[PDB]
Design a protein around this nucleic acid. Structure first.
Lengths: 362, 117, 439, 22, 395, 606, 42
DNA sequence: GGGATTCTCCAGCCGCCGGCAGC
DNA sequence: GCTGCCGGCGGCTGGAGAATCCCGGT
């Protein structure tokens, strides 16, 4: 896989960008549209052939001093419209419908700044938010119900700024400044009942408010993987990828070699490292690594703006690959990258309010 | 008085502020309030439409005003020609029945749809 | 220094008050003649008796004097068209806006049809006729508003009667211009058969100054305020978004304006509307419950005289929107009920007191299960007094008898009871009774 | 160490006892 | 669509208007009291009785109200509101705990459309439901605490209609004579002088079907036992003289205004004055001696009108409420008085005062006895306002 | 040492085997990844979604702000008009917290959990605060100098290879790895390697549960050792969440003679109705060899410790033996057991009423001697007196605290609180419990109703609400002063309990450690409790932690003894009606008060 | 040393007081500003 | 002789009120 | 003039510490 810089975008408002995400829900043959966050503004773009990038509609929350940094793509199960979720330092959840040019849903209640937004891969209406509140929340979309709070006594004891969703859509994991990598489940009967009851709640029908499920105890929790801020997570089937300020992404799994994720006891205390990925100049936290839909290549941006691309094949992690996609203007730090629906192209965002496009030439 | 009380998050969001900005700009370009009406008067531009010739030695002519406000057509003698080409009146003097057409946000029946009378 | 912040901050109230001026001029919130500090307005006094039985005589006299004239059925002939095809003649009658109708309906009834030449010229002819029918009645005319005539070939429309049914169309040959979609025109014959300053300070870093032209008039609402006292009162009461100060410039007066710092003028309706998602906020499709409040704004003002030296309301009830303690969600009025969302027995700490029990290595599970069960039992009630244990142990039995029997931990349960008795909390006459009641 | 002391909110209270009848 | 955007903008500007009115009210009123009911009321009338507790600076008055709820148990509510009756006294004026409290609550069979107290016996009041019947309640026979069992059985329920409607007024001189208005184009008469054998059900004694459109008003000529006015969506005002034994043939019939009209009131201190307002944004009055001539058209409203009330203790003063979210005060003593240009710009001289203290459509308003100048008004924003304009306005 | 070098030398082959395992692990993971992604792609393929269109300039804003997305290449800069998002009413900052109705001791975390994040601007010129904090923790931050990690396998191999060429190796391992940080773990690993066996879930002295199949005959003390050690007497919970485990076991005196001791026929197989057994009943003050299991023998040994004579009750509690069988087992085994102690006390004094006057004499001694330094109120701890009385060497006496019922003082200890005697509402100064601020314990003030009606909440006593936890209904909303606030729903009169201030119990130094970051956050929850402990509500608590400071508040805080625990209750300083925000003074130093709370909410009236 | 340094998120790194026509210069700063002379009141 | 039963004694607190510094 | 201001001043609250009654046997 070889990517060449075909085009570069700069919003020119001189504010760091975050949370670039492709609209993976777009059907086959649809235009390649992705979202990107800049300051109090939300920007969408379309990717054309030959590297041409067209500017789509942009939204701004000028009503207050706001700094957004998150995107999450979902589709409306009723009207088939594509929806976008935006959150910022104000702890505000915003749902924007580009078709109607307006925001038709907003959620408040988070205790502090949101940090990562991800949707349930199987159920588009379940929306998860990662916040400085030291807790996690899963939101419902068809109904405005909120049923999850992952935090408290055995939750993260500091800011949470990353989470990931399993492919089957039954298990979440979280990481934060407390060096803790904590595991959460949806396949549990209690969570399934809560999710089912979330759609079965009519606020006008009953005086009682919805019974949101408070969850303080993760299924598995460890703190020995990283000795610094663990700041981005992705899953590898059952194996887990996590990165920190120690300039190295780590691959690991709970338990031992023969330990199954379903059989992991709640009181598990032994972890197993699997592999390492090496890079330099990762001395600043809040940098994220991205993964394609087919889980075949890995990508990561750096403070010096160099890109680190490695495939996820049978290649051993010691010598999996060494790819550094660079350009002389990449001096700005990268925050997050995004892969297309079929890993054809990749988009990166930076601190200097710039957007970079990478197209694959196999 | 105190050092710093919480800001109550003023209800006029910028979303309605931009709409008000467009409405004011288009309304000033359509009525010339701040420029010609001195901030309190709406202007109207007339033109001869129908030249009628009465039974006696008198000629009356219609003058139709551009903004198409609540005012109806009025017969004007030919002697008043070139005198009422541009006419200015105060906002309060417009006919109350159909003065709402000046701006949709001047007044609307907020319960536009009613389950009961 | 880019002053854009100053521009935006001082532009924010400009639009609101300029729009409010035009809104109030067409229809005011209140009569400005009735304001106390606007005393030079409303020169009329309330001295008038006007017995009602004599108003009818005055009305009858006015009506008798007002019988001006009555309309004369009309006929008209059309002169040739003029331009730099048969004609269509339709009569348009408009009724008043009724409750069911969204707007005022019109009725373009046709009086017939006639032929006209294709743009003829004068001195060439050597004549079509349209006649009206008076089959209608004043009872039918009760629901009508006005009358007008429409001519098409190219559409024109003129009115015959005024608002008060005053005739505007006498008999005579009339020439009318024509507008499509000088120029086109048509002819036809009808027959009946001190200087004030303003300063805009910005954080003392920089400022902008103006002069109050058209003095004694508000720059925002264009209100004629003859007195400086009335002007200042109106500015500080209606244009509350700004803060004003008196400086007494040698020209006669000076008013330094600045943006209000607090201006506690947020949403004042039902507070739960602002949190609701768009499409449900301010829906007004039906009643919306809210917690009752009570505010008094005016009780008995002193009604003092004009005072230039004067320049240099309580509430009771839930005056805010309350939130859930845990989820920070808005609290609905029905959710404000006996449900206090805070009980003696949190679930998370129940779970923790079970997880931490298994951590102890030198305990068999047979004792751990009894420990957890009894901890949950006490936590369900939070016993404090020592005399409760007779009833507390009896109720523990009555609650968890099935669970312990299925767990086959009765012997461990009586071991726990013995442990309690070693602490002088349980009498010897209660252990046997608890065991007997178990079966 | 512990040279610096953090600020803790408090609620001071002291109490005597009642004198017997004489 | 475009309706929602302008609706939101107008909601914001209406909130701004309400805030400005709240800031300007100290220099415009001698008394302002506001309270938000748990549910909006479609009725507003003061009970005739009053108590003045000695040794304090307030007097207690009772309000006749109702409950209009989206989905909840529906009640008939009578609230006790204390008013400051002192000029030098100025909590706000009296106690700090509370000025308005609910004292009577009676379960209802649906929404409360209208409710008018019998002047001779205030303990018995009649109410109109969206159903086809009229309910008679006597709150002395019902507990203050509403029973959880739902709809309370009224003393009597009156049949004769087939569709919803709310036009109500009690006979000022006789007890039990009730004429009511409903959308069935019918006006029904009941005689409740004494009907022990009713079994809580009373049929209409006389049904008036004179109008061909929806009738929503009935008010008696207060100085005659046989003359009352009736109003319809038929754009006419129509007076019926009873004992004529002609449910079709009226005493008189006059085309009132150009659109649907529903509000009619007879002046208490006059034998021939009748006034009414219409959806045409006009209030017009007539003389019973000559119905074919309109005395004057009060024209300052901007929207539909569904209430006109004559001010007691001031014959020459009239007030009317409508969906314009304003309460207007009209003074006939100022008809045609010359005024200064600024006064003319403010409005016609005959308009005495306009009340801007509402955020939604006003459903009902009333002038009270036992107090000459305070007015209560209930709107669709769940807010209740009791207000008295500044003394400098009159005398 | 060369522990890292040896670990790498072994890790050569260890990582060879690890690579052998992880190649197959990666292959299986990729196979499952392919299957799951195939399922997800199939689920996605079935849905059609409307494409997004470009943004035409809306007629709602002719003059507005437009963003010019520029490009570094030859592509033209694109300009589009911004759409203004609708505003949302936000909420003030409030970190997550678990609900709490009691208190909570936290084990002193000697290591820093994690370095908190700050504004990244002030520390640029004042970065020495980080060094001050690490000096407060003396460099003990999680993961500091970890030298990698050990999975207890390489460490075990190094320890085995660390022969004489135990203790020095243990110290080196502890220094090189903070995960263990103690020689106890190294010695445990050494013992495990030497023995290569574990006794089981039971302690090293195997004591399986009675109901389990692995029954064993164990004496009463060892059988009930776990129950006695882990049970906590004060607040009635095994493994108390608000009490330490450092306490004496259940070994204490008891009333030996508290039974009728009337001989009766206890069924057909009774201890009585047999001449030999009847004689042996008094003496101990054809025996069949029944299969008395180990659990049965251990539980007989336990049950003999509660009656010492009643074979009827013990045998009725024995499903496998009868009363005659109980007597036979007694003659068989307990005839060789130690004689019963049958100990008792004398207790000469009988003037219970006069004890209050002497009680007040000790209180007067305290209030006349230690009044100069009486601000050092010490956390109560139940003192255990083996033989000495409640003398000047009594731990409770030196703590200047009255002896609660959990004391090991004599039954008439002079320092023991006898209890209030109010016949009615006891919130007045006439109540002794109010003077020396305390809550009437439900075992002493039976007249005031503290003991009575424990189920219902209609109690005359107003000095027992904290024990019953009958806090009012309180609501949460943004404050009118700063951040969140708490608002009371129902009206409350002056001097009425509203709620308790619950939180986490921590030491004074741990309180300083938490306050070090609380000061930087400018927001604190530290409530001083006593001279020993500080209750912290940052992580747990209830709605009350949002109450704001006020120099002229409407509520006051009082630290009171509640059954031997320092608890903080809040009361109304004045009458408060519906919808008011609650305030109380934080008792801060004036400079620190103005630094932390600089909002007054009101100007001076004159 | 590296284990205790401050973890950083980012890199190391008008004279003419004309009239109240300033208000008519204020609201329509674009789209055909009126009077053609309020620009002097900038 | 005890035990339940009243029954005043007391120390402290609360609200009011009449001088006492200023103006 | 009037502002706290202050201590007494009678008026009241409730603990509590003694004076009184009756049952039961000698």
């Amino acid at each position: 896989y070889s990517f060449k810089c075909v085009n570069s975008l700069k919003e020119d408002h001189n504010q760091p960008l975050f949370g670039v995400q492709f609209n993976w829900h777009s059907k086959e043959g649809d235009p390649l549209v992705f979202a990107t966050v800049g300051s109090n503004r939300v920007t969408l773009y379309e990717c054309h052939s030959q590297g041409e990038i067209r500017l789509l509609q942009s939204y701004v929350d000028a009503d207050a001093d706001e700094n957004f940094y998150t995107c999450a793509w979902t589709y409306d199960s009723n009207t088939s419209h594509p929806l976008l979720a935006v959150a910022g330092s104000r702890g505000i959840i915003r749902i924007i419908n580009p078709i109607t040019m307006q925001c038709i849903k907003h959620y408040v209640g988070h205790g502090n700044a949101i940090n990562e937004l991800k949707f349930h891969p199987r159920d588009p209406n379940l929306l998860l938010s990662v916040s400085k509140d030291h807790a996690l929340r899963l939101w419902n979309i068809q109904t405005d119900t909120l049923v999850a709070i992952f935090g408290g006594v055995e939750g993260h004891r500091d800011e949470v700024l990353s989470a990931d969703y399993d492919l089957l859509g039954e298990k979440i994991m979280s990481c934060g400044m407390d060096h803790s990598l904590k595991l959460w489940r949806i396949n549990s009967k209690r969570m399934m009942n809560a999710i089912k009851e979330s759609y079965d709640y009519n606020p006008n029908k009953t005086n009682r408010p919805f019974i949101s499920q408070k969850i303080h105890f993760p299924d598995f929790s460890t703190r020995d993987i990283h000795r610094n801020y663990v700041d981005c997570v992705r899953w590898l089937g059952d194996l887990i990828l996590s990165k920190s300020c120690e300039n190295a992404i780590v691959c690991w799994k709970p338990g031992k070699m023969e330990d199954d994720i379903d059989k992991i006891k709640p009181s598990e205390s032994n972890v197993t490292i699997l592999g390492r990925f090496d890079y330099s100049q990762c001395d600043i936290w809040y940098m994220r690594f991205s993964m394609d839909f087919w889980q075949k290549m890995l990508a990561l941006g750096n403070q010096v703006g160099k890109l680190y691309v490695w495939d996820l094949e049978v290649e051993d992690p010691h010598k999996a690959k060494c790819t550094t996609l660079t350009h002389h203007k990449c001096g700005a730090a990268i925050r997050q990258t995004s892969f297309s629906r079929d890993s054809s192209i990749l988009i990166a965002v930076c601190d200097d309010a710039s957007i970079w496009r990478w197209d694959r030439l196999r | 008085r105190r050092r710093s009380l919480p800001r109550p998050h003023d209800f006029f969001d910028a979303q309605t502020l931009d709409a008000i900005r467009h409405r004011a700009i288009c309304f000033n370009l359509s009525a010339h309030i701040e420029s010609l009406g001195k901030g309190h008067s709406v202007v109207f531009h007339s033109t001869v439409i129908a030249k009628r010739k009465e039974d006696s030695g008198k000629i009356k002519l219609l003058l139709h005003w551009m903004p198409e406000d609540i005012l109806p057509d009025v017969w004007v003698n030919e002697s008043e020609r070139h005198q009422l080409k541009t006419k200015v009146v105060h906002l309060s003097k417009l006919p109350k029945d159909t003065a709402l057409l000046l701006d949709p946000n001047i007044y609307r029946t907020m319960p536009q749809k009613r389950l009961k009378r | 220094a880019d002053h854009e912040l100053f521009l935006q901050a001082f532009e924010k109230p400009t639009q609101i008050y300029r729009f409010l001026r035009t809104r109030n001029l067409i229809a005011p919130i209140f009569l400005h003649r009735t304001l106390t500090y606007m005393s030079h307005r409303n020169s009329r006094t309330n001295i008038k008796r006007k017995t009602f039985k004599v108003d009818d005589m005055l009305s009858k006299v006015e009506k008798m004097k007002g019988e001006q004239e009555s309309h004369s059925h009309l006929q008209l002939t059309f002169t040739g068209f003029f331009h730099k095809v048969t004609l269509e003649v339709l009569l348009v009658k408009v009724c008043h806006k009724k409750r069911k109708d969204v707007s005022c309906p019109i009725r373009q009834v046709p009086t017939g049809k006639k032929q006209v030449p294709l743009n003829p010229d004068l001195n060439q002819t050597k004549p079509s006729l349209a006649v009206s029918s008076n089959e209608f009645e004043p009872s039918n005319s009760h629901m009508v508003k006005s009358y007008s005539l429409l001519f098409r070939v190219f559409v024109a429309q003129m009115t015959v009667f005024d608002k008060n049914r005053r005739l505007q169309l006498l008999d005579g040959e009339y020439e009318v211009a024509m507008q499509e979609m000088q120029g086109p025109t048509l002819q036809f014959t009808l027959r009946w058969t001190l200087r004030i300053f303003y300063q805009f300070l910005y954080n003392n870093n920089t400022r902008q100054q103006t002069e109050a032209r058209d003095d004694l008039h508000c720059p925002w609402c264009t209100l004629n305020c003859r007195k400086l006292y009335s002007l200042l009162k109106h500015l500080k009461l209606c244009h509350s978004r700004f803060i004003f100060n008196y400086v007494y410039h040698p020209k006669g007066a000076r008013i330094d304006v600045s943006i209000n710092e607090c201006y506690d003028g947020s949403y004042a309706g039902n507070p739960q509307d602002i949190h609701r998602q768009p499409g449900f906020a301010f829906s007004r499709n039906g009643p919306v419950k809210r917690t009752p409040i009570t505010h008094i704004l005016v009780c008995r003002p002193k009604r003092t005289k004009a005072s230039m030296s004067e320049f240099l309301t309580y509430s009771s009830g839930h005056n805010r929107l309350y939130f859930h303690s845990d989820t920070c969600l808005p609290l609905r009025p029905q959710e404000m009920e006996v449900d206090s969302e805070d009980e003696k027995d949190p679930e998370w700490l129940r779970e923790k007191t079970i997880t931490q029990i298994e951590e102890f290595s030198d305990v068999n599970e047979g004792e751990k299960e009894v420990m957890k069960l009894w901890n949950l039992h006490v936590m369900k009630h939070g016993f404090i007094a020592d005399n409760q244990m007779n009833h507390a142990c009896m109720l523990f039995v009555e609650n968890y008898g099935q669970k312990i029997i299925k767990k086959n931990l009765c012997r461990n349960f009586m071991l726990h009871l013995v442990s309690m008795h070693d602490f002088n909390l349980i009498s010897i006459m209660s252990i046997d009774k608890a065991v007997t009641k178990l079966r | 160490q512990l040279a610096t002391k953090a600020a803790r909110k408090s609620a001071p209270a002291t109490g005597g006892v009642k004198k017997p009848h004489r | 669509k475009e309706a929602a955007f302008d609706d939101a903008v107008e909601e914001r500007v209406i909130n701004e208007e309400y805030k400005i009115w709240k800031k300007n009210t100290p220099f415009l009123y001698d008394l302002v009291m506001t309270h938000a009911l748990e549910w909006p009321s479609l009725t507003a009338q003061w009970l005739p009785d009053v108590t003045r507790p000695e040794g304090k600076d307030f007097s207690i008055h009772r309000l006749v109200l109702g409950t209009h709820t989206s989905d909840e148990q529906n009640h008939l509510v009578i609230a006790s509101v204390q008013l400051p009756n002192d000029d030098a006294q100025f909590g706000g004026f009296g106690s700090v705990s509370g000025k308005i409290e609910i004292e009577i609550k009676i379960n209802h069979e649906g929404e409360v459309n209208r409710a008018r107290y019998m002047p001779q016996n205030p303990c018995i009041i009649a109410t109109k439901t969206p159903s086809s019947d009229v309910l008679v309640f006597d709150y002395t026979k019902h507990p203050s605490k509403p029973d959880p069992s739902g709809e309370c059985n009224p003393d009597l329920r009156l049949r004769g209609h087939q569709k919803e409607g709310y036009g109500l007024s009690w006979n000022p001189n006789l007890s039990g004579h009730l004429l009511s208005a409903s959308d069935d184009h019918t006006i029904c008469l009941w005689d409740i002088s004494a009907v022990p054998k009713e079994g809580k059900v009373v049929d209409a004694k006389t049904i008036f079907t004179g109008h061909t459109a929806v009738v929503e008003d009935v008010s008696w000529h207060l100085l005659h036992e046989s003359l009352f006015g009736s109003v319809a969506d038929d754009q006419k005002l129509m007076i019926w003289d009873t004992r004529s034994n002609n449910t079709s043939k009226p005493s008189h019939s006059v085309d009132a205004h150009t659109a649907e009209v529903n509000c009619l009131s007879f002046n208490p201190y006059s034998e021939f004055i009748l006034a009414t307002g219409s959806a045409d944004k006009t209030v017009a009055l007539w003389d019973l001696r000559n119905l074919k001539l309109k005395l004057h058209s009060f024209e300052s409203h901007k929207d539909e009108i569904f209430q006109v009330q004559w001010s007691p203790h001031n014959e020459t003063i009239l007030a009317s409420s409508g969906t314009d979210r304003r309460l207007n005060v009209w003074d006939l003593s100022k008809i045609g008085e010359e005024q200064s240009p600024e006064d003319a710009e403010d409005g016609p001289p005959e308009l005495l005062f306009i009340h801007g203290g509402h955020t939604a459509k006003i459903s009902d308003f009333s002038w009270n006895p036992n107090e000459p100048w305070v007015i209560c008004s209930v709107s669709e924003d769940n807010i209740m306002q009791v207000w008295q304009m500044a003394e400098n306005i009159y005398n | 040492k060369r522990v890292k070098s040896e670990y790498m030398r072994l890790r050569q082959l260890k990582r060879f085997r690890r690579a052998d395992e992880v190649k197959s692990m990666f292959s299986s993971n990729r196979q499952k990844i392919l299957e799951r992604t195939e399922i997800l792609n199939q689920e996605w393929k079935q849905r059609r979604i409307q494409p997004v269109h470009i943004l035409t300039s809306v007629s709602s804003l002719r003059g507005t702000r437009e963003c010019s997305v520029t490009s570094d290449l030859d592509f033209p800069t694109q300009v589009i008009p911004l759409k203004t998002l609708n505003a949302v009413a936000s909420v003030p900052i409030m970190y997550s917290w678990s609900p709490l109705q009691q208190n909570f001791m936290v084990e002193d975390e000697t290591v820093l959990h994690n370095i908190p994040y700050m504004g990244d601007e002030v520390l640029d010129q004042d970065g020495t605060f980080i060094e001050e904090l690490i000096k407060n923790y003396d460099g003990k931050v999680h993961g500091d100098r970890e030298c990698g990690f050990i999975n207890d396998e390489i460490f075990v191999e190094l320890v085995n290879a660390l022969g004489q060429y135990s203790d020095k190796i243990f110290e080196a391992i502890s220094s090189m790895f903070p995960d263990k940080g103690t020689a106890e773990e190294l010695k445990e690993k050494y013992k495990e390697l030497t023995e290569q066996q574990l006794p089981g879930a039971l302690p090293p002295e195997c004591t399986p549960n009675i109901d389990g199949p692995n029954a064993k005959s164990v004496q009463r003390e060892q059988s009930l050792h776990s129950f006695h050690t882990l049970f906590c007497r004060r607040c009635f919970k095994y493994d108390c969440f608000l009490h330490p485990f450092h306490a004496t076991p259940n070994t204490y005196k008891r009333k030996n003679t508290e039974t009728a001791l009337d001989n009766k026929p206890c069924g057909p197989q009774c201890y009585q109705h047999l001449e030999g057994a009847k004689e042996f009943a008094a003496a101990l003050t054809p025996p069949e060899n029944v299969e008395w299991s180990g659990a049965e023998a251990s539980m007989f040994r336990v049950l003999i410790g509660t009656y010492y004579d009643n074979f009827c009750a013990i045998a009725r509690l024995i499903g496998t033996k009868t009363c005659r069988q109980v007597y036979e087992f007694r003659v068989k085994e307990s005839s060789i057991i130690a004689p019963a102690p049958a100990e008792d006390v004398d207790t000469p004094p009988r003037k219970k009423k006069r004890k209050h006057r002497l009680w007040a004499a000790h209180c007067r001694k305290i209030q006349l001697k230690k009044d100069g330094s009486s601000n050092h109120v010490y956390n109560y701890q139940p003192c255990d007196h083996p033989r000495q009385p409640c003398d000047s060497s009594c731990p409770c006496v030196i703590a200047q605290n009255f002896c609660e019922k959990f004391c090991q003082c004599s039954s008439e200890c002079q320092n023991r609180f006898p209890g209030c005697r109010c016949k009615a509402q006891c919130n007045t100064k006439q109540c002794p419990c109010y003077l020396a601020v305390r809550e009437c314990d439900p075992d002493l003030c039976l007249t005031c109703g503290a003991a009575d009606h424990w189920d219902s909440k209609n109690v005359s006593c107003k000095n027992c609400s904290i024990q019953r936890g009958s806090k009012k209904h309180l609501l949460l909303a943004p404050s009118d002063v700063a951040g969140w606030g708490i608002f009371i729903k129902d009206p409350v009169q002056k001097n009425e309990f509203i709620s308790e201030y619950c939180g986490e119990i921590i030491s004074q130094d741990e309180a300083d450690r938490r306050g070090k970051v609380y000061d930087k956050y400018m927001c604190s929850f530290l409530f001083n409790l006593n001279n020993d402990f500080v209750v912290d509500a940052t992580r747990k608590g209830n709605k009350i932690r949002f109450a704001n400071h006020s120099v002229n508040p409407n509520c006051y805080a009082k630290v009171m003894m509640v059954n031997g625990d320092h608890r903080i209750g809040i009361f109304a300083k004045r009458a408060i009606q519906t919808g008011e925000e609650l305030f109380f003074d934080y008792r801060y130093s004036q400079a620190d008060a103005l630094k932390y709370v600089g909002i007054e909410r009101e100007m001076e009236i004159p | 040393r590296p284990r205790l340094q401050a973890q950083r998120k980012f890199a190391q790194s008008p004279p003419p007081a004309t009239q109240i026509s300033d208000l008519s210069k204020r609201k329509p700063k674009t789209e055909d500003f009126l009077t053609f002379l309020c620009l002097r009141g900038s």
